[PDB]
């Protein structure tokens, strides 16, 4: 659907200059102004570059835009963790695809951050939930990097396959990652086992927390 | 000081219409156009059209097959987008944004999530995740709240009416098999504070017009 073409991903380590290409044709980039946007999860896009290469208020000059022929480029100099976001190009377009077109977005990852094993907290069902004849175990996984984990659940020592829901890791305010997993059970299942465990695998090694009724 | 403030998230049945509003401030409303851009969850930005606040000219994206109408009210500095004959493929965050020739689409509203579904709104069930000796790790203790079985997105969570922010993480929601969402919010606090400090999670689910303030107390 996007008329302009950007790479789906770009990456670098801190202090690198990362470039993101945006290609189109004569009716858009070739003849018209290009714009760039930064978007963080859950937030609106923010204008980063207008008019091919101008920075609006508050955008620091380590972001630079350029254009040549029918392709444009955003350069993120001095890369740092706060630059992890999606970046979109856009342009006016004089063809039938116009009047305004977007690229498909580029997700920027910043590598070379300090590795960190996860912290795991496992909450039992609350007394309130049990009194409502339901039960959820809540496994919260925090302060890890890189942002990838797997979660497995056990009842006593037996693997539990059903009733599990697991979120994709996302960044904490401190730029490390967190994730969550839930196990739904009946109150009688909760009460009838000696313990339940959540086992988190990160970078090949595991951290497992156990709770007991 | 340019700001565009949109109306709240909404759920709509297939075949219904939605009208989103966008209140502009910090500049002369008629001096710029207003564009609308939508974004399906996790996906890219799609231009829908734009209107000249000053002279009324409009241009709409062909792929919407005539289903969008854009209007403005100069007296209240508000722009509106109405999308008719809704379908589930219309589920998206809808953004208002200011438009002009030089600066392009420059300032954007905060976005409005419109969920198109035959299911009815449902407010959350909020349960405390109580601190205990088992949720404490050398000087810090975790406590939280579990926000269960709501529809549609979004929910917001604060702690102590916004006074407690350091050490807070609110997780993304998961869409369960029932078609309802659940999420959690957790705070890491000093163990010593557990006595004499209070903790209330403030859950707002605007789609169902429900707010829940749940006290989270030691077991």
Most residues in contact: chain pair: A-B, 46 and 43 residues
Question: What's the helix count of chain B?
Answer: 0
Report how far the terminal alpha carbons of chain A are from each other: 53 Å
Number of helices of chain A: 2
The CATH topology annotation of the largest domain in chain A reads as Immunoglobulin-like
Strand-residue proportion of chain B: over 45%
Q: What would you call the shape of chain A?
A: elongated
Number of domains of chain A: 2
Distance between the termini of chain B: 47 Å
Question: What are its keywords?
Answer:
heterodimer, A: 213 residues, mainly beta, Immunoglobulin-like, 6-stranded mixed β-sheet, 2 helices, 18 strands, B: 219 residues, 7-stranded mixed β-sheet, 20 strands, 0% helix, 51% strand, elongated, immune system, HCV glycoprotein
Give structural notes.
The complex is a heterodimer of chains A (213) and B (219). Chain A folds into two domains: 1-112, Immunoglobulins (Immunoglobulin-like, Sandwich), CATH 2.60.40.10; 113-213, Immunoglobulin-like, CATH 2.60.40. Helix content of chain A is 5%, strand content 47%. Chain A is built from two helices and 18 strands. In chain A, a hairpin with a 6-residue loop joins strand 3 (34-39) and strand 4. Chain A is elongated and about 70 Å long. Chain B is mainly β. Chain B contains no helices and 20 strands. Classes of the chains: A mainly beta (213), B mainly beta (219). The A-B interface holds A 1-2, 33, 35, 37, 43-47, 50-51, 56, 88, 90, 92, 99-105, 119, 121, 123, 126, 128-129, 132, 136, 138, 140, 142, 165-168, 170, 172-173, 178-180, 182, 211 and B 35, 44-47, 50, 59, 95, 102-111, 125, 127-130, 134-135, 137, 142, 144, 146, 148, 166, 168-169, 171-174, 176, 182-184, 186, 188.
